Symmetry: D2
Subunit: 336 residues, 4 copies
C-alpha cells in the first residue's frame, strides 16, 4: 500500500524529490531529516520556490514540530546530525534518499540502515555505490544491493542520448560540453572555493569553466563507451535548466535526418519519459518543469558530415533528476 521513503537533506534536490513524492499515487514521504532547518522554516522553504512556483497541490501546516501535515497526511521531521542515529524505522521509511551531498560514500551512506532503513538511494555520483540511470542500466539492479546512486543530472541527460546514438550508429569517440545553470555550491560575489577556484567567482556575472565527470561516468553505466567520452562544463548566469552539447564521430554514416528520426523513435518508444524530442525554436525557460532526463533539440544541433555531428539536449537539472530519483526507487521496489 505505497512505497515509504524518507529524505535526508532538504535542499534543492531533497525538496523537489519531496514534491514529486507528495504528488504521486505510489510513494509516501514519511519523514525528512535536516539538523539545520527548524520545522517552521522547512514549511516555508518547501512552499515557495524561485524556480518551480508555489506548492499548491495541498496545503501545508505544522502539527507539532516533530511533525508536518501535508493535506491531512503526516510527515515526521527529524533533526538528527548522525545518519547512524536517524530512527527511519520509527517512521516506516523503507527507502532513504541521501541528498545532503556529504554521505555519497557507500559506507557513509550505509549509516541509514542502522536506523532501520532497508534501502538508500544516493542522489549524486558515488565512488563505490553502484550507479543506475533510468533508461540506461536500471535493469542491472538486483535486490541484494542496498545502497545505490542515481548518478548526476548531467549523466542522466548524456547517457540516454549517447545510448541511442551508440546503439544506432556506433560511437567511436566523443567530447561533451554542458552549458550549466548556476548551483548552490557557487558564490554570489567572488569568494573562497579552495577546491575549485573558478567556482568561487561571482556566479551570475561570469561564464565559468568547470570540470565534469558525467561523460566519464557514462562509461560506468554503459561499459561499451568506457574511455570513449569525456568533456567539460561552462557555468552561466541562469537559475535552472542546462544543456548538453555532444560532439561525436560515429562509425556508421548517418544523415542528420536519420539521427533525428532515431532519437524521435526512441522518445516515442521504450525511452518515452526519459528522452524527449523537440523541433521548435525553444530556449531554457521553456523546459522548466519538464520531467524528462534529456530533451533532444533537433534544430539546435548541426552536422559537418555523415560521421561527425554535434547534438544538443536540454535538461531541467533540478526537476528531471528529481523525478528520476523516484523513478529509480519505483524500479527497485518492483524488483524481487
Amino acid at each position: 500500500g505505497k512505497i515509504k521513503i524518507g529524505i535526508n537533506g532538504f535542499g534543492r534536490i531533497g525538496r523537489l524529490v519531496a514534491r514529486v513524492a507528495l504528488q504521486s499515487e505510489d510513494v509516501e514521504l514519511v519523514a525528512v531529516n535536516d539538523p539545520f532547518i527548524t520545522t517552521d522554516y522547512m514549511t516555508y522553504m518547501f512552499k515557495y520556490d524561485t524556480v518551480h512556483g508555489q506548492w499548491k497541490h495541498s496545503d501545508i501546516k505544522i502539527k507539532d514540530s516533530k511533525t508536518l501535515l501535508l493535506g491531512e497526511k503526516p510527515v515526521t521531521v527529524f533533526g538528527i546530525r548522525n545518519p547512524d542515529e536517524i530512527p527511519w524505522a520509527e517512521a516506516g521509511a523503507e527507502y532513504v534518499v541521501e541528498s545532503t551531498g556529504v554521505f555519497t560514500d557507500k559506507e557513509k551512506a550505509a549509516a541509514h540502515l542502522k536506523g532501520g532503513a532497508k534501502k538508500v538511494v544516493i542522489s549524486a555520483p558515488s565512488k563505490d555505490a553502484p550507479m543506475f540511470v533510468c533508461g540506461v542500466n536500471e535493469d542491472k539492479y538486483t535486490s541484494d544491493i542496498d545502497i545505490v546512486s542515481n548518478a548526476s543530472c548531467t549523466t542522466n541527460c548524456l547517457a540516454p542520448l549517447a545510448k541511442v546514438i551508440h546503439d544506432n550508429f556506433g560511437i567511436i569517440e566523443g567530447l561533451m560540453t554542458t552549458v550549466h545553470a548556476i548551483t548552490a555550491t557557487q558564490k554570489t560575489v567572488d569568494g573562497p572555493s579552495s577546491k575549485d577556484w573558478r567556482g568561487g567567482r561571482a556566479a551570475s556575472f561570469n561564464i565559468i569553466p568547470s570540470s565534469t565527470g558525467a561523460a566519464k561516468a557514462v562509461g560506468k553505466v554503459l561499459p561499451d563507451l568506457n574511455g570513449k567520452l569525456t568533456g567539460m562544463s561552462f557555468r552561466v548566469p541562469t537559475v535552472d535548466v542546462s544543456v548538453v552539447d555532444l560532439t561525436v564521430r560515429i562509425e556508421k554514416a548517418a544523415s542528420y535526418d536519420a539521427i533525428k528520426s532515431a532519437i524521435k523513435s526512441a522518445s516515442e518508444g521504450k525511452l518515452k519519459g526519459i528522452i524527449g524530442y523537440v523541433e521548435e525554436d525553444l530556449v531554457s525557460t521553456d523546459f522548466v518543469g519538464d520531467s524528462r532526463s534529456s530533451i533532444f533539440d533537433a534544430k539546435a544541433g548541426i552536422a559537418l558530415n555523415d560521421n561527425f555531428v554535434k547534438l544538443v539536449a536540454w535538461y531541467d537539472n533540478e526537476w528531471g533528476y528529481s523525478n528520476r530519483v523516484i523513478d529509480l526507487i519505483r524500479h527497485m521496489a518492483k524488483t524481487q
Copy 2:
C-alpha cells in the same frame, strides 16, 4: 613613519582595503589572516576581481608558504581561526582591519590586542565599539580608544548626506530605502538562511527586501538626528554599487535647486572626497571605482514641495567604504 596595518578576513572588503593601502604612500600592509585562503590562493584572489579589474600596479608572487610579495614588498600571511592567536606584533601590524564579519563585538574584536595589535578597526557596525563616519564624526575619536567601528557602507552614504541637509535646512523626519547590490551573505539558489529567510532566496533572480539599522545609526554619529530617521532595503540583482533613496521633511523651506547647491558646495569644500555631486544621466556601473562615500544624483531626485523631497545618493558599497576604512586609520594615526 609609515602606518603598519594587518587585515583579518581577506574578502570583498579585506582585499579592496589591501588595494587602497598598497596604492597609498602612507599606509603599509604588513600581514593578512584568513584560514579559508592559503597563501597561493591569496595571490589569485587578490589579482583577479569580477568588479574592480585586474591588479596592475605591481606584480604578485609567493615568496614562501608564509609570505606573499607585492612588487618586492613582503606581506606575511596567517591561517588562524581564533583572532587572539594571531601574532600581529611579530609582523609589526599596529592597526588591524577586522573585516571577517564575525568579530564585530568589541570583546571579540579586542582578541587582536592579545597578539600585539594596538588598534582594531571593525569594518562593520558594532554593538558596543564606538562608530565613526569620516566627514561626520571622526573627530570624536580619542586615542584612549583601541577598538572602533567604521559603521556600514550605507550609514557612510546616508550620514554625510543627512548632515548637509540638516545643517542647511533642518531635518524633521526621514525614511530611507537603499536599492542594494547583492553581497556575500546571499545565496546563488534558494538555500537556508535561518536568521533571514528572504535572504536565503536566489539572489540574482529576485528583488529581496531586508531590514537595516543603517538609517537609525545615523542618529548615533549625529545625536541631533536621534529618533528622526529609519528605513529599509531591497537587495537587487547587481554585483556592486548601491543607492540611497532618502524621503525627508525639512523645517526651512527650500527649492530643489537650493538643496542641490547646498550639496554641491559641500562636495567642493568641507566634505570633498566624502560627498560627491553629479548632474548627469548616470547608472550604477558608472560609479564603480568611485572612492566617495555618498554621490548625490541631482537629476534622479524629486521634490513634492519646498519641505518634502526625495534625495538620491549612489555609493560603490565595496570601494568607497574600503577607502573610508583607510581614512579612519589615517585619522586615528594622526590623533595626538
Copy 3:
C-alpha cells in the same frame, strides 16, 4: 452572452490580456491585430513565455492565415498598420484593447471606432482619455464614454493602497519609489534611447533611475490626492514583478499594526481581488502570476512614528495589469 473583444498589438500586455480572456467564462477574444508578427509566428509567441509558462489550457493551431484555433474557438488575425482600417466589426469585437503603446492619445485610439468597435480600452496612461482604475474610481465611468484609459500598472498598484490609507488615516503628502522589473523599451546593451538616456544603458547590468508619472496620476482617479503625491523609479535586473515603496505622512495617528489591520480588512472586503495582503518573508518571484493589483507586504514596511510611515506593495506588473484590463471591460459592459 459573452463580451466579444479584440486586441491591437500582440506584446507583453496584449498576449497576457489574451490569456486572461481565453481562460475566462466571461469574455471572448474574437480577433488580434499585429503587422509585426506573422500568423504562424503569433502562435509561437503566444504559446511559450519566459515568465508565465507555456500555454497548455487549449490546443493552438493555425486554420488558414487570418485564422487561429485555440481548441475549437476561432480567433481572427489581422496585420493592419493603421488602426482606422481594422474591420473589428467583421470579427464581432465590440471592445478593443489598444495595447500598442503608440496610440494612447484619445483621438488616435478613436480610429478603432471607424472599423465598428464600440469601445476602446487603452492599456496605458493617456494624455486626455478618461482614466479609470478598478477598485478606485471605475464607478465614475458612464456609458457615453467610448474611449478610456486603464492607467499604468504602477498606478493600479499605488492608487488602491493610497485610497485605503487616505480614507482611514488621511494622506497629507507622500513620495513614491518603485523598484521595477525591466521592460521592452529597455536595451540589452548600451544603445540609443533619445528621450531617456539612462534608459538606453544595459538593462540587466545596472540599477537605472527613471521618471514616472504614476504617483501624480493618482490625483486623476482620486481628486483629494491631487498634488499630494509624486515619485520616481529604479529599473533593476529582474524579468517581471515590481514593488511600490510609499512613504507617507498621515493626518490621523496610527500604529503600524492599525495600518496593517486596515489593509487586511480591505483585502478581505470590497477590494478583495484588487488589494492583497501578506505577512510572510516573500520575494518577487513569489508574486509571478498573482492577479491582484497591489499586494501589501506587511513585514517589509516600517514606521518612524504614528504619522510617518513607509509602506511596500508588490505587483506582477505584467499579469495583475492584464487582468485589470479585462475587469474594466467587464464593468463597462455592466454599465447602463
Copy 4:
C-alpha cells in the same frame, strides 16, 4: 602621416573602435556619422560605458553643433541615414569603418566612396566583400581592393587558433560551439524577432541557441580548411566576453602539453597581439579589455586522446574585434 578615419554607426563597435583610434598615436578619428544620436547625446554615449569604464584618456567637449573636441582634436559629427550622402572627403576621412550592420553588402558599403572616402572596412562578415582576419590572411589584401570585411569577432577568435593547430598538427575536421554574451540585436523581454524567433526571447533570463557561420567562414580566410569546420552558438546572460569551444580531430598525434606549447609559442612569436595564452583559473570578466583576438585557456580544455581534443579560447567580443578593425586599416595603409 596619421591615418585619417571616419566611423559610420556609433554603436558598440563604432564607439569602441573610436576609443582605440583616439588612444592610438598613428590613427586619427576625424568624423563620425549616426543620425540616431545627436552631437550632445554622442558625447554621453562615448564617455560612459557599462562594460569598458569611463573615457579618461582625454576631455570630451562640444565645439558647436558638428565638431566634438577630444583633447583638442576636432571630430566632425554627421547625422545622415543614406551612406551615399556622407561627405567624408570634407572631414578628410580616407578610411571608413562601416559599423551600422546594415550595409555589409559590397555594393551598399561602396556608397561611402561617392562621398570621397577611398577605403571601406566593414565591421562584419559580408556575403561578397573580401574578408580578412589579422594574423591569418590580411597579407592577401591588395591595394586595388577598396571595400573589405573584417569578418566577425567569432571568426577572428576561431581562425588564429585554427591556423596554429592546423599548421602544427593538421586539422582533419572540427565542430565549434561559442558560449556568447548578449548583443544589441537581442531583447530585454520576449519580443518580436521575425528572422530569429529564439533571439526574440528575454536575453538575460535564457540560454538561447543560435546559428552562426563563423566557423564555416574560417574556410574563406584559410582555404585549406574549407568545409572542415562548422558549428553553432549559445547566447547566455553576460554583458560582454565570449568563448570558443573547438572540438577537433587532428592528424599528428600530440599530447595536450605539446598543443599548449604550440599555442604559447605562437602567442610569443608571429601571432603576438593576436593569440594570447593563459594558464590560470580565469573567468569571463577577467578578459574584459583584452585586445587579443583569441586567448587560449590551457586549463579549461580537455583531451580524450592524442588525436581528439577540445580547445578553449576566450575573446572580448567587443574590444578584441574593435582593435582588429584598426589593425586591418593599419595594414591597408602600409600596403598602399
